[PDB]
Design a binder for this molecule. Structure first.
Ligand SMILES: Nc1nccc(-c2ccc3c(N)n[nH]c3c2)n1
Length: 279
């Protein structure tokens, strides 16, 4: 069927910068014809080509097109001009989950449970499509106006059937094997839960090399103020042997993960319809 004509830069009033990476900048934009706000990710073609990033840009576009779920930033449109590529993305007005962790220090058990459940539910959907994020972290987990999560940044994703993420969230197998799987995301999940509860990521040190040392030695520990059921859950995710992490295929998938006692009170079927606990 006839899709709308390609959009163009002149269709938008660009505004503030929402994020910037080494190969991209995200800018808030208001579409003139609709008054709709989008987060437009802008990439310089010459820079992408010069640095051999075409496969990453291509993978991000192809992945974000296949995703159709409330807990993921949506790709609405793409266009280009002579110098740049533009991706129209969902605007998550409340920014990064990381910001909330810093602002309030640590989450109480109700908020930890609710947001962990959304991430688990998001991962179940992503993994059921044979997609692996490979760089999951609080910086990539955005909050919409409604305070529900929206996971973004899929340039580094792998579609099942090479790259190393953000040091604090790298799984051991990436350091010893150079190979990633769904279980690498579950490892990151373990780190994120721990971070929501402790206020800090589990593996910390003065530099990348020392963080990696700690990861492969499973060198971290829990604070006394750690919800016992959350602790048990984290211990079942932060496991060196990737095939023994709660949630992976060899452990029989998402059922047993979702049935963990930490999630006892969670109703999984309609999280996105529930009202997030106030932060
Ligand atoms: N795919 C991708 N890559 C890099 C950054 C982003 C991104 C960053 C910030 C926002 C926001 N406030 N709303 N939407 C965003 C999307 N998205």
């Amino acid at each position: 069927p006839p899709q709308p004509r390609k959009k163009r830069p002149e269709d938008f009033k660009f505004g503030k910068i929402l994020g910037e990476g080494s190969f991209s900048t995200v800018v808030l934009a208001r579409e003139l014809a609709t008054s709709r706000e989008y987060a437009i990710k802008i990439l310089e073609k010459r820079h992408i080509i010069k640095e051999n990033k075409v496969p990453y840009v291509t993978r991000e576009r192809d992945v974000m097109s296949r995703l159709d779920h409330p807990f993921f930033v949506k790709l609405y449109f793409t266009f280009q001009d002579d110098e740049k590529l533009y991706f129209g993305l969902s605007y998550a007005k409340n920014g990064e989950l990381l910001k909330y962790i810093r602002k309030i220090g640590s989450f109480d058990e109700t908020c930890t449970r609710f947001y962990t459940a959304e991430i688990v539910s998001a991962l179940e959907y992503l993994h059921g499509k044979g997609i692996i994020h490979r760089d999951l972290k609080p910086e990539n987990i955005l909050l919409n106006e409604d305070m529900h999560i929206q996971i973004t940044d899929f340039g580094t994703a792998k579609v099942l059937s090479s790259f190393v993420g953000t040091a604090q969230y790298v799984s051991p197998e990436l350091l010893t094997e150079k190979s990633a799987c769904k279980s690498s995301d579950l490892w990151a999940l373990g780190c994120i839960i721990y971070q929501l509860v402790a206020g800090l990521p589990p593996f910390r040190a003065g530099n990348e090399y020392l963080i990696f040392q700690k990861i492969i030695k499973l060198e971290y520990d829990f604070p006394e103020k750690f919800f016992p059921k959350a602790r048990d859950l984290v211990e079942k995710l932060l496991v060196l042997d990737a095939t023994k992490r709660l949630g992976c295929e060899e452990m029989e998938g998402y059922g047993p993960l979702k049935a963990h006692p930490f999630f006892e009170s969670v109703t999984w079927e309609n999280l996105h319809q529930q009202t997030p606990p106030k932060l």
